Structures are given as C-alpha cells and as structure tokens.
Amino acid sequence: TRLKIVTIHQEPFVYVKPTMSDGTCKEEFTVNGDPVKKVICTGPNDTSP
Amino acid sequence: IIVASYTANLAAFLVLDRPEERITGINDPRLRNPSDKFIYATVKQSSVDIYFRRQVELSTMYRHMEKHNYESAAEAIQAVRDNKLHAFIWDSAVLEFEASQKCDLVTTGELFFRSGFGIGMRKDSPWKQNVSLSILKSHENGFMEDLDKTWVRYQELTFENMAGVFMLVAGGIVAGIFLIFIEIAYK
Amino acid sequence: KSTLWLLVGLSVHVVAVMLYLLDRFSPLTLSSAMWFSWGVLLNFSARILGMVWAGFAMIIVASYTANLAAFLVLDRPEERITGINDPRLRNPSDKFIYATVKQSSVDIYFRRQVELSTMYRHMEKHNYESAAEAIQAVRDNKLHAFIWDSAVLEFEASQKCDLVTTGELFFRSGFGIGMRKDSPWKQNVSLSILKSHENGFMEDLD
Amino acid sequence: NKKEWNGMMGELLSGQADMIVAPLTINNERAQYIEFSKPFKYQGLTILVK
Amino acid sequence: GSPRHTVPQCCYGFCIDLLIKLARTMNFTYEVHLVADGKFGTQERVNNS
Amino acid sequence: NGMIGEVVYQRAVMAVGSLTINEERSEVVDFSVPFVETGISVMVSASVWVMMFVMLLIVSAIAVFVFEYFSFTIGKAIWLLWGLVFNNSVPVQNPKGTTSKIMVSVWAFFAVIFLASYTANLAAFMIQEEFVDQVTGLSDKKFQRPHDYSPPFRFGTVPNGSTERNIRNNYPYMHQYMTRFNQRGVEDALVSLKTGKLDAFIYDAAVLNYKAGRDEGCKLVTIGSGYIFATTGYGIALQKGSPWKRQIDLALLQFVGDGEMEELETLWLTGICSSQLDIDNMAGVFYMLAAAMALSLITFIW
Amino acid sequence: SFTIGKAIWLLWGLVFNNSVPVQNPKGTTSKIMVSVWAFFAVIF
Amino acid sequence: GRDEGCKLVTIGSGYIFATTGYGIALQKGSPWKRQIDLALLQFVGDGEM
Ligand SMILES: *[C@@H]1O[C@H](CO)[C@@H](O[C@@H]2O[C@H](CO)[C@@H](O)[C@H](O)[C@H]2NC(C)=O)[C@H](O)[C@H]1NC(C)=O
Ligand SMILES: *[C@@H]1O[C@H](CO)[C@@H](O)[C@H](O)[C@H]1NC(C)=O
Ligand SMILES: *[C@@H]1O[C@H](CO)[C@@H](O)[C@H](O)[C@H]1NC(C)=O
Ligand SMILES: *[C@@H]1O[C@H](CO)[C@@H](O)[C@H](O)[C@H]1NC(C)=O
Ligand SMILES: *[C@@H]1O[C@H](CO)[C@@H](O)[C@H](O)[C@H]1NC(C)=O
Ligand SMILES: *[C@@H]1O[C@H](CO)[C@@H](O)[C@H](O)[C@H]1NC(C)=O
C-alpha cells in the first residue's frame, strides 16, 4: 500500500522549499485561488561535491 | 539625393541585414566543426548524451559537448546568463516556461526528436495495467488542460543610433547659448 | 520569366471647406484662403487644425512610401521552381505541364527511380520529339517546365532572355562519343580527347 | 569491468526505490531492461540561446 | 511529313568542329550523316516475338 | 466492428494501420508504445512626444529670448516649429535672427533624421506577417450556441468515430448540436470547406496537417499546435497476451531513436506555407481629428 | 513680377522639400500645376 | 562551405579552368574494370551519389 516515490529536482516541475517552523509547509494559493497541496519529501541540500 | 542615399543605407543598415545570432537547429555546419566561440553542451549523464553517442554523424559534437557537461539545468541557465555558454540542448515546454520567466532566454525554430515524458516503472507488477488506465483516464478528461493551466499555459521606441546624436544636439544647444551670448556682446 | 486616396481626398474636401467656415466664423479672399488650404495639405485655431492635418499629410505620404516599399521590395512573384524539390512537380496538376524528349535517357532514369513514377506517368502524355518543339510549345505557354541539360538551355537563354533556368543542378553527367566494341580506335582516340582536355581547345570551343 | 547503473535507476534496481515518478526521457536503452508506462508529455529537442 | 526527302545539307557547330579536330589528330576519312528518327534509343519491346 | 471486430475475435493478428487510442479500445486490446504526436484539431478557413514637447518649449523660450533682445512670434514660433516638422511648406514667418535660423536648422536636421528613422520604423513594421484567429479554444463562446453570434455557423466530425465517443463523454450537448450538422467523407468535408458548405471541422491533428501541406493555396489554416486539444498518440494494437509485444516496442524505439523516423516524416509530409491596409490607422486619424475639433469647440467659448 | 520663365526656379527648386522661400505664385494655373507637380515630385 | 563567415570567395564555377574528373586507378588489363565501372554507373544513376 506504501509506494516508494523518487524523482529528480526538475526546475518547473519539482519545487523544493525549506520547512517553516517544524516539518511543515506554507499553504499558499495560485492565481485562481487553488491551494497548492504540497508533500513532505526527504532529500539532500546539494550533490556530493 | 544625399539624404535619400542616407535614408537608403540606414534602411540597409538596420532593416534588411541582421547579425546571425540564431543557429537554425542541429544542421548548422559551423557547429559541426565548432571552436571556442561556440560553447555548447548538455546535462551530464542524460538520455540525450546516449542518443547522440549512438548516432555516428553526431560524434564530433559529442567530442565537444563532453568538455563542459553540467550537473543541473540551473547551472546551464546561470552559465548562459553569465555568457559562459552560447547554446543549450533541452526539451520544449520547460524552455518555454523559462522564456516566460526570463525574456532573454529565446529558443530556436527547428524541432526534432519528438520524445515523451512518462513514469519510470518496474518489471511485471500489479502497478502496470491499472496505472496506465489511470493515466489514460487523466488523458481523456480535461485534467490535462487543468495541468496546462497550472504551469504550461500560465506565462509570466527608435532610440538606437540617433540617441547619441540627440545628446550631441542638446550639448550643441547648450554651447550655442554661450555662442549667441558672445554674438550679443559682438553687436 | 488608390481608393483610400479617394477617401482621403473626399475627407480633405470636407476639411478645407469646414476650416474656411471656421475661419469666417472667427473674426477674392475666399479663393485665396482655399488656395492657402491647398498649400497647407500639399507642397488662429484653424491654423492649429491645419498643422495637425499637415501632420496627417506627412503620415499619409510616409505610409504611401511604406506600402510601395511593401509593393516592390519584399514581395516576389512565385515563378520559380527551385529544382527537383518542388511540391508543384511532386504533385502535378493541369497547369503544371512538364515533359522531355520522347524515348530519351530521362525516361529510363525516372523509370528506374520508383519514387519518380509520378513524373513517369505524367510526362508520357506530353512527350515531344525534338527540343525545338519544346521551345515552340513553351513560347506559346503550352509548357511549364522541361527537364534538360544545362548548355543548350543556357545558350537559348542567351538567345531568348525570357527562357530562364532554375537553381538546382542534379545528376551531374558526362557527354562523350558513342563508340563501338573492342577496336583499336578506342585508345588513342580517347587520348586525343584527353589532349583536347589538357589544352585550351575546350576554351576555344567555349 | 562490469557495467552498472546509477541515479534514479541505480536506486530503483537496487530495491531502494519502487516507483520513479519523474519526467524522464523515455528511450530505447532504458526500456530494454525494465518496463515503461505510456507517456503523458510529448515534446521534442530545441536549442536555447541569448 | 516526308514521303521521300533525304538531302545533303550543311552542318557545323560544336561537335562538328570537335570531330574536325579529331580528324586533324587521327588519320581517317569520314562519312557524316544523320539519324532517321528523332529519338535517342530505348530498350523497348518490338511488337512481334 | 471493423479492425476491432477482426482483432478481438481472433480473425486478425494485429492492427499495423493507424488507430485512435481511447479508454475502451485500451480495454479490449493492448496498444504498443507511441511513435507520432497526433492530437486533435479544428480546421477553419511612450517617451517621444514628451521630450519633443520639452524641446518645443526650449525652442520657444530661446525665441522669446531673441525677441527680448531684438514681429509677434513669441508664441507663434510654435506654429512655425511643429508645422515645419512635416515639410508641407506652409508659409509661416521669416525670422531675422541668426539664432532662430541656426536653431531651426538644427531642428530641421533632427526632423530629416527623424523622418528617415520613421520610414525605417515603417519598414520594420512592414517586415512582419501578422497571424489572426477566429476561434481560440475548444471552450469557445461560439461553441456554446451559433445563435449567440451573428453568423449561425456549422461544425462536423467523421461519423461513427472514437472522436464522437470522446465528445459524447465530454460534451453531450455538443453531440446534440452536431446531430443537426453531420457529414460523410473526409474529402467531402474538404470540398465543403473549400466551396463553402462547411464552416469548421473537427478531426485529428497530423492528418489535417498533411492535407494542408498538399493543398493548393493554403487557405484552410489550423489553430494552434495541439495546446487546447487532446494531444495523444498513435501506436500498434495487438491482442492481449501477445509474446511479440516487447520486441515490437524495442523495434519502434530503435526506429525512433536513430533519426530514421524523422527521415520518414520528411518523406511523407510537406513543409510549405500584400496590398495596402491602414484602416485601423485611418480610424485613429478620424478619431484624433474628431477629438481635435471637439477641443476646438471647447476653446470656442471665448 | 518676374515669373516669365523664372518659375523653373520654383519648379525644380520646390521638388526637394527644402523650405527655402522662392516666389509668391499668383496664377491659378501655376498653383494647380505646382500641386500636380508636387504630388509628382513626392511619388518621384 | 566550412568557412568561418564565408570570408574566402571562390572564382567562377569551372569555366576558364581545367574541368577534368576523378577516377579509380587500376592496372592495365585488369578484369575488375568493367564491374567497377558498372557499379559506379549504378551508384550515380539512382540518387545515392
Ligand atoms: C596512337 O594511335 C595509333 C593507332 O592506334 C597507335 O600508334 C602506334 O603505336 C605503336 C606502339 O604501340 C607504335 O609502334 C607505332 O609506330 C604507332 N603508329 C603506327 C605507325 O602504327 C597507338 O594506338 C597510339 N600511339 C601513340 C603515339 O600514342
Ligand atoms: C485494475 O484493473 C482491473 C480491470 O479493470 C480491475 O478489475 C481491478 O479491480 C483494478 N484494480 C487493481 C487490482 O488495482
Ligand atoms: C519538308 O517537310 C515539310 C513538312 O512535312 C513539308 O511541308 C515540306 O514541303 C518539306 N520540304 C522539303 C524541302 O522537302
Ligand atoms: C597518316 O597515316 C599514315 C599511314 O602510314 C601514318 O604513317 C601517319 O602517321 C598518319 N598521319 C597522321 C596525321 O596521323
Ligand atoms: C511496338 O509498339 C509500341 C507501342 O508503344 C511502339 O512504341 C513501337 O514503336 C512498336 N514497335 C515498332 C517496331 O513499331
Ligand atoms: C455509421 O454506422 C451506422 C450503423 O450504426 C451505419 O448505418 C452508417 O452507414 C455509418 N455511417 C456511414 C459510414 O456513413
């Protein structure tokens, strides 16, 4: 039932934002009032160099 | 007839001719034998690299684009913004959205290797038929148009050479003020 | 190988009369003021409206220069074929009449090429005997194209300037002397041909 | 002297991942080893300049 | 057009003077005549056999 | 019926020919990988004046200075100034001051280079070929009702098609308005669009692109490039459980992944395809002269 | 007062849009001819 | 055709020049001559050249 999902940091497709207070997101709207339902992902800051 | 010839050669200078900043796609012979003036590469370890590696008529560019392989596409954006590049190979709609972001980033006219983005999947698995049926159900309704409304569809004077002439006209007026006061002192 | 000017003329024939009425309403002379308006549109609020109309006259003559430049510089009549890669000849019609000499090398050369079978089926209803028949037919505009070698067509272009060739040069071939089988007149006759090649006798024949 | 994979395919084939939901360029060689789904996005290649 | 009219006329030009140069080079006499029809020649089926 | 009736009932092996892909066709058989992008389509038939005003006031102030040194051309120098920009040769005033002659000569040199640059601007506007459209989407207000706009137009598809099923599963009222507007043949609809027995037509994308690439005159013009459309692909249909499917998919990926597919598309497509018009500019001319006579009627109160 | 044949200096002088004063035209035939010639000079 | 900016310009298109051709050098009396000649005539007269 739990599916491992992995992706690459695509610039117009995968937007990564730091946490606001503690493991949370900022619920913002689009230009048409649609709230962007974010997801809690886990990843590194940059590459190995 | 002097000012008619001047109108004619200014129309020759700024209308008909053009500095060929464009490449006209992959079939540019000057990029078939590149140099240090034509700095162009792609993302390191991509499918486009293997696609150009299989084709034997794209080996020479494969000998060139291997010199400056970049990790991410944002590295290529920062390099071509800071004039470290001259051309970049990438897909269409991402560059269209970034052209909506930055107006200086302009694509070219040609379009080749019409490929497709999907979802990377495993071998024989129960997540094969139902997932593809869900994708086709997303294709058949207006959800793809809504996805285009999220990111794809949502986008974001004549002072060329005679502006300096206009500034020299203004400076000539300023100097002519003192020249006319000297002419007033003359008579 | 106009009406908008009439509308502007009717407009200014209204404008000059109403500006003379404006000048009369604002405190020999009639025709003189009309002639002054004639000198206004062509080489005191009425003077202000007249100088605004003079600005309109400059933008009208600038638009006239601009659209005559559109009329003769950028546009080009589609009278060219640009060689074998023309979709007019890949998909012919009733007004696309192209042929060659009947029972020539063009027939076999387009009969081997199976993708050129459309021209093979088209020219077989139009093949003529001699090239002079082709010249006489294309002079009366019965033809539209003619697949032929370069030298004869360039010589007839020097004769008749309306005969214009195209840009592409395909199937670079060679013309020699028709010779028999094994014979002693094959070797040193060809050596004489090569001796004609090495000197300026080809230039003399040019 | 053995050929392997890395990146998303390296994490997938090692069992560390189970479903690569990513806009990956679907090509010949990567489908020779694993099965792919039908693509959602369709676009070609082009050149970005300044 | 022509029931029987085959006459000797005058011929000159490019290939004629080329053959005159060849006859100046190689030692031979000649017999210049013309082709009967107006065709090059194709490998076409004769109507019998 | 058709190829689905031949393949599913095991009278045919596979559908090598072209076929639209939707839900129930993917339910009955298993399609291959796509090879061509074939969606659906609809075929149908502010700084110059400010600085010139500032320099106009500067020229008028210099003329006032010349008048203060040395007949009524205090504010009437503007009538000589902007009037002789346009070189229509209106008799205005003969100045005696050398200052005014030098200033008007510099202004006239600026006017000559300004008119030359304006002819260059008109040529640069004359370079471009503008593109106009009538319907800009599948959700058009024209598509709601043809009585809503002044021409009652007409739209058609091919009969018995999967596009009709997609419309009936997307917009049943569109099928209701299409029921009065049916037709039979693709080339019949082509002749109906050319002669004028049809206004717009709804079909797939690349087939109409091939028909427009071979058409005389290039009058029928597409709308967009698959942006407000279905944007699907074509593949090969095989029976469910066929062992040859993976090898056919690898063969298609080899045929696409070498540039040979682009050569085949180049072989089987065609990549082909005035007078005076200033009616918007002339309408602006008439509107500005109407505003000018309105301002004159305002100033007539004194 | 001097427009016998001196109007050539107004004819070919006002072809070129020079804004230089030359002569005051008085004949109606002269003014109509100068208007037609001025349109001819603009198109020329 | 590979010139940087088309700086060097040719003269003519073979008019007051030698106007010769290229061939395959074989030995005198070689049996492979006719086969290579017919192969070249096939390679030119099909659009492959
Ligand atoms: C030129 O053509 C003639 C006739 O085919 C040949 O000339 C003879 O060549 C042989 C040598 O093979 C000499 O011994 C003879 O003296 C030549 N002439 C005579 C009198 O027969 C040969 O084909 C060519 N020879 C040259 C000079 O190139
Ligand atoms: C997957 O698809 C089949 C066929 O439509 C259906 O019977 C089944 O319930 C679906 N669910 C699964 C197993 O994910
Ligand atoms: C040659 O042929 C033409 C056409 O058949 C004929 O009219 C003419 O009389 C003939 N002339 C001679 C000289 O035989
Ligand atoms: C003419 O033929 C004779 C035959 O003996 C030969 O010797 C001579 O070389 C020839 N002359 C020319 C011009 O070839
Ligand atoms: C045989 O018939 C064909 C039909 O085209 C014709 O072209 C050919 O001239 C005929 N052969 C002879 C000997 O006339
Ligand atoms: C569409 O299908 C119907 C049967 O449902 C048939 O009668 C009709 O002829 C078909 N349309 C065509 C091919 O004109």
- For every residue of F239-272, DSSP letters joined together read -TT-TTHHHHHHHHHHHHTTSHHHHHHHHT----
- Cα separation, B135 vs B126, whole angstroms: 15
Using an 8 Å Cβ cutoff, are F204 and F21 in contact? no
- Cα separation, C163 vs C144, whole angstroms: 11
Asked if C206 and H15 come within 8 Å (Cβ–Cβ), the reply is yes
Query: For helices C3-25 and C45-69, what crossing angle results, to 10°?
Result: 170
Query: For helices C29-41 and G28-43, what crossing angle results, to 10°?
Result: 10
Cα dihedral C81, C83, C84, C90, rounded to 10, equals 0
- DSSP letter string over H2-31? --TTS-S----SSSSS----------TT-T
Asked if C195 and E25 come within 8 Å (Cβ–Cβ), the reply is yes
- Cα separation, F136 vs F223, whole angstroms: 7
- Residue in F189, F107, F176, F123 with CA at minimum distance from that of residue F145: F176
Using an 8 Å Cβ cutoff, are F237 and F31 in contact? yes
Using an 8 Å Cβ cutoff, are F193 and F220 in contact? yes
Cα dihedral F274, F277, F281, F286, rounded to 10, equals 170
CB contact set of B67 (below 8 Å; sequence gap of 6+) = B41
Strand stretches in chain F, DSSP E: 14-15, 30-31, 36-37, 40-43, 155-156, 200-204, 233-234, 237-238
Q: By the CB < 8 Å criterion, does C171 face chain G? A: no
Query: Beta strands F233-234 and F237-238: pairing type?
Result: unpaired
Query: Beta strands F40-43 and F200-204: pairing type?
Result: antiparallel
Using an 8 Å Cβ cutoff, are F202 and F40 in contact? yes
Using an 8 Å Cβ cutoff, are F79 and F56 in contact? no
Length of chain G: 44
List the Cα angle F246/F250/F251 in 5-degree steps: 115
Spell out which residues line ligand 6, taking CB within 6 angstroms: F 159-160, 184
Look at residue B109 and give its three-state secondary structure. Answer: coil
- DSSP letter string over B151-166? IIS------SSHHHHH
- Cα separation, F279 vs F285, whole angstroms: 9
- Cα separation, H17 vs F278, whole angstroms: 55
Tell how far the Cα of B133 is from the centroid of ligand 2, in angstroms. Answer: 9
Q: Which residue has the tokens 């070929």?
A: F129
Asked if G21 and F94 come within 8 Å (Cβ–Cβ), the reply is yes
- Cα separation, B78 vs F4, whole angstroms: 53
What does each C-alpha distance from A8 to B51, C80, D7, D20, D31 come to in angstroms? 20, 53, 9, 9, 19
Using an 8 Å Cβ cutoff, are F32 and F233 in contact? no
C-alpha F155: how far from chain center: 21
Query: Beta strands F14-15 and F237-238: pairing type?
Result: antiparallel
Residue A29 is classified by DSSP as B
Structure tokens at E29: 């006499």
Query: Rounded to a whole number, what is the distance in angstroms from the first to the last CA of chain E?
Result: 30
Characterise C131 by phi-psi region: left (phi > 0), alpha (psi -120 to 50), beta (else): alpha
- Cα separation, B134 vs B140, whole angstroms: 10
CB contact set of D14 (below 8 Å; sequence gap of 6+) = none
Enumerate the β-bridge partners of residue C98: C145
Structure tokens at B86: 């001259």
Using an 8 Å Cβ cutoff, are B24 and B108 in contact? yes
Using an 8 Å Cβ cutoff, are C147 and C106 in contact? yes
- Cα separation, F81 vs F91, whole angstroms: 12
**From the candidates G10, G19, G34, G44, which should be mutated to test the interface with C, based on the most C CB atoms within 10 A?**
G34
- Cα separation, F202 vs F296, whole angstroms: 55
Cα dihedral B143, B144, B150, B151, rounded to 10, equals 170
Structure tokens at F245: 């499917």
Radius of gyration in angstroms for the set of CA atoms belonging to chain A, rounded to a whole number? 13
Using an 8 Å Cβ cutoff, are F124 and B12 in contact? no
Resolution (A): 7.1
- Cα separation, C193 vs C57, whole angstroms: 72
CB contact set of D26 (below 8 Å; sequence gap of 6+) = B115, B116, B117, B118, D36, D39
Nearest CA in chain H to B34: H4
Structure tokens at F119: 């002819």
Residue B57 is classified by DSSP as G
Sign of the CA dihedral C83, C87, C89, C94?
negative
Q: By the CB < 8 Å criterion, does B107 face chain D? A: yes
- Hey, how many other C-beta atoms are within 10 angstroms of the C-beta on C44? 10
How many Cα atoms are found within 13 Å in the side-chain-facing hemisphere of C112?
13
Helix (H) or strand (E) holding C67: helix C45-69
Q: Give buried/exposed letters for E9-25 (b at 16+ CB in 10 A, else e).
A: eeeeeeeeebeebbeee
- Cα separation, C58 vs D18, whole angstroms: 73
C189: amino acid identity, one letter: V
Query: Which backbone phi and psi does F200 adopt, to 5 degrees?
Result: -130, 160
The reply to whether ligand 3 has any atom less than 6 angstroms from the CB of E9 is no
Q: Nearest CA to CA, how far is F37 from chain D (Å)?
A: 7
Look at residue B179 and give its three-state secondary structure. Answer: helix
Query: For helices F162-170 and B129-140, what crossing angle results, to 10°?
Result: 70
C157: amino acid identity, one letter: A
Using an 8 Å Cβ cutoff, are F227 and B148 in contact? yes
**From the candidates F82, F88, F89, which should be mutated to test the interface with G, based on the most G CB atoms within 10 A?**
F89
What does each C-alpha distance from G22 to F92, G3, G12, H14 come to in angstroms? 14, 11, 11, 61
Cα dihedral E10, E12, E18, E24, rounded to 10, equals 50
Query: Which backbone phi and psi does F122 adopt, to 5 degrees?
Result: -65, -35
Using an 8 Å Cβ cutoff, are C76 and C123 in contact? no
- Residue in C11, C66, C63 with CA at minimum distance from that of residue F286: C11
- Cα separation, B178 vs B185, whole angstroms: 10
Q: Which residue has the tokens 């030009």?
A: E13
Structure tokens at B120: 């990377």
CB contact set of F136 (below 8 Å; sequence gap of 6+) = F223, F228
Q: Tell the residue nearest (CA) to atom 11 of ligand 6.
A: F159
Q: By the CB < 8 Å criterion, does F281 face chain G? A: no
Look at residue C98 and give its three-state secondary structure. Answer: strand
Tell how far the Cα of C131 is from the centroid of ligand 3, in angstroms. Answer: 19
Look at residue F52 and give its three-state secondary structure. Answer: helix
Using an 8 Å Cβ cutoff, are C88 and C96 in contact? yes
Which residues is chain F interrupted after (C–N above 2.5 Å)? Answer: 45, 70, 273
Structure tokens at F15: 């559908």
Tell me the best of B127, B128, B129 to mutate to test the pocket of ligand 2, counting ligand atoms within 8 Å of each CB and taking the most: B129
Q: Give buried/exposed letters for B128-151 (b at 16+ CB in 10 A, else e).
A: eeebbeeebeebbeeebbeebeee
Cα dihedral F20, F24, F28, F32, rounded to 10, equals 40
- Cα separation, C104 vs E43, whole angstroms: 11
- Cα separation, C125 vs F239, whole angstroms: 48
